[PDB]
Design a protein around this ligand. Sequence first.
Ligand SMILES: *C(=O)CCCCCCCCCCCCC
Ligand SMILES: [Ca+2]
Ligand SMILES: [Ca+2]
Ligand SMILES: [Ca+2]
Length: 184
Amino acid sequence: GNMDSKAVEELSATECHQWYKKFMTECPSGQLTLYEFKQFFGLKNLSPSANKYVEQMFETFDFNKDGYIDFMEYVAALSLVLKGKVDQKLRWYFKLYDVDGNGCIDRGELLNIIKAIRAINRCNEAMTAEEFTNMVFDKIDINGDGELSLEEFMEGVQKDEVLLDILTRSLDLTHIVKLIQNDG
Ligand SMILES: *C(=O)CCCCCCCCCCCCC
Ligand SMILES: [Ca+2]
Ligand SMILES: [Ca+2]
Ligand SMILES: [Ca+2]
C-alpha cells in the first residue's frame, strides 16, 4: 500500500504479537470484512487488477468462507505470509491447496488457488496457470491418479527449485506487496 520494499521486509520479520495486538485493538470484534482488511493494511483505492488480487487473497485466507477473516484465520494466514520455517510452511501450503480438505490436492483445486494468488506471475517466462498446473502433476503426481498426497507434494516440490518457489513463496509478504503495486 504505502511503503517501499525495505519497509515490507522489516514487517515480514515483525513478531506475530505486534500484528495481533494491532488487529485486536482495532477490530474488537475479532473479525475483518474485506473492506476493513483494506483499511487495516492500507490497501484501498488500488487499480482494478490489484484490487481484484486483494479480494481473492482475502477469500483465500477466509478459510471458512463466511466473509470475514477472524482471529484464528488471521494468525494462520500470517504464519504463511510472514518469515518462518520453510519446513513448516510446506504443510500449510498443502492444506491451502486442498480446497475440500479431503487430504489430497486435485488438478482443479491447484488450478483455482494458483490463479487466485497469481503464483504464475512469479515465474519468468510464458506459463499459463493451466499449463503450470498440468506440469506439476506431470512431474510430481508419481502414481498418476490425478491427486497429490502430502507426501508427493513435499517430496516433489523439494526436488524442484522452480516448483518450490512458485508453490510455496507466492504468499511471502514481500512477494504480495511487490505483486500489488505492479498491477496498476
Ligand atoms: C503496501 O505497501 C501495504 C503494506 C502491508 C501489506 C499488507 C498485505 C497483507 C496480506 C497478507 C497478510 C494477511 C493477514 C490475514
Ligand atoms: Ca472466515
Ligand atoms: Ca482435495
Ligand atoms: Ca498421486
